[PDB]
Design a protein around this nucleic acid. Structure first.
Ligand code: DGT
Ligand code: CA
Ligand code: CA
Ligand code: CA
Length: 341
DNA sequence: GTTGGATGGTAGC
DNA sequence: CTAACCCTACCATCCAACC
């Protein structure tokens, strides 16, 4: 069982570089401008030139301009990156039909039937990197291992423009030696709980009682972590089926005023419903980000598919329910559809 | 006990 | 307006319905 993983390098900014080659070699920051004030919003991503100075995903645009005023700031053009991505996903399809598109910039290939061993896998990695480079001028990082998790870790260890194999023996080693915080699915909350327990390595999860581990991090995470330490993790590559689709937007200013919010909600519904594309949802959720960045939601599941009109009426009601039950002003409003027929 | 709906937490993009 | 966007996957917990 061999898995090949592809993660595109500094994706959004790299795409801007390919569109505009004069940008290459200098700092580029791709931004989400919220319109609340001059330069309000956050960085979506930046090239390596900009990361050298601390500019990266998630920081505020003004914070990036403070620490890097002369960089090139461009607005996130989501659709453009999606088009480049799709073309790249189709190139990858010509290498294995058995492909899991896992996000805007990454995919898993099961190549067990394409190659005999890690060596040939490494070589396909080379051919894949070159082809994506011929056709789209985009550099990627390849990770190759026995499963999804270690193929992801391998690519993380090689970024940028790298390729890395983690073979059966280094999986053993990594189980004993890799900091557990570095395992995909282990964020800052789980990391801290593990530290208190004195669980630092995957191997450590085999020397603690399940109930005690499950009591701290929850069942599924405990199962997942143990499965990896036992080297019995084998989740198959599966065709990507979206479970929810939606849209969220930032308001000019914070409001508790239904009439001042409505236009944004409706903008989010039109865009959401368009992205459904023949998919018919049975659930709608209105999502509100409050003044203090708390995420709050109200939803409804129908026994039947929701029409655009039903979505219009229900989300207004659902918004009012948020206003009824939470006293805070709202800052971002959106809508999410799930449970596709 | 099972399934699943409402809502929130965590994670990573 | 004074920093904090976009999008999706998955799970936990608190309850209700089933039977
Ligand atoms: N709006 C927004 N977009 C994000 C965020 N994080 C990532 N993205 C988008 C932009 C990225 O280019 C793309 C892929 O995310 P990655 O984590 O793989 O980062 P990226 O490819 O830019 O860096 P890479 O060289 O792996 O390190 O997803 C975020 O916090 N907000
Ligand atoms: Ca990625
Ligand atoms: Ca990437
Ligand atoms: Ca981590």
């Amino acid at each position: 069982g061999i898995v090949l993983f592809v993660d595109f390098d500094y994706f959004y900014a790299q795409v801007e570089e390919v569109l505009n080659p004069s940008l290459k070699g200098k700092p580029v920051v791709v931004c989400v401008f919220s319109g609340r004030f001059e330069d309000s919003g956050a960085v979506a991503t930046a090239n390596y030139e900009a990361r050298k100075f601390g500019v990266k995903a998630g920081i505020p645009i003004v914070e990036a301009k403070k620490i890097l005023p002369n960089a090139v700031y461009l607005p996130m053009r989501k659709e453009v990156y999606q088009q480049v991505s799709s073309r790249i996903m189709n190139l990858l399809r010509e290498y294995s039909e058995k492909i899991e598109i896992a996000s805007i910039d990454e995919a898993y290939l099961d190549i067990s039937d394409k190659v005999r061993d890690y060596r040939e896998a490494y070589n396909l990695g080379l051919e894949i990197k070159n082809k994506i480079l011929e056709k789209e001028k985009i550099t990627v990082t390849v990770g190759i291992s026995k499963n999804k998790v270690f193929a992801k870790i391998a690519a993380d260890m090689a970024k940028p423009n790298g390729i890395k194999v983690i073979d059966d023996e280094e999986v053993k080693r990594l189980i004993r030696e890799l900091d557990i915080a570095d395992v995909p699915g282990i964020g800052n909350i789980t990391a801290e709980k593990l530290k208190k327990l004195g669980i630092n390595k995957l191997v450590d999860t085999l020397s603690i009682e399940f109930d005690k581990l499950k009591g701290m991090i929850g069942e599924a995470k405990a199962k997942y972590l143990i499965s990896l330490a036992r080297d019995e993790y084998n989740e198959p590559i599966r065709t990507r089926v979206r479970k929810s689709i939606g849209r969220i937007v930032t308001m000019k200013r914070n409001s508790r005023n239904l009439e001042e919010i409505k236009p944004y909600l409706f903008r989010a519904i039109e865009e959401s419903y368009y992205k459904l594309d023949k998919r018919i949802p049975k659930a709608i959720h209105v999502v509100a980000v409050t003044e203090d960045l708390d995420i709050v939601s109200r939803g409804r599941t129908f026994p039947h598919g929701i029409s655009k009109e039903t979505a219009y009426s229900e989300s207004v009601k659902l918004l009012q329910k948020i206003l009824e039950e939470d006293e805070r002003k709202i800052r971002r409003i959106g809508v999410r559809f799930s449970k596709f027929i």
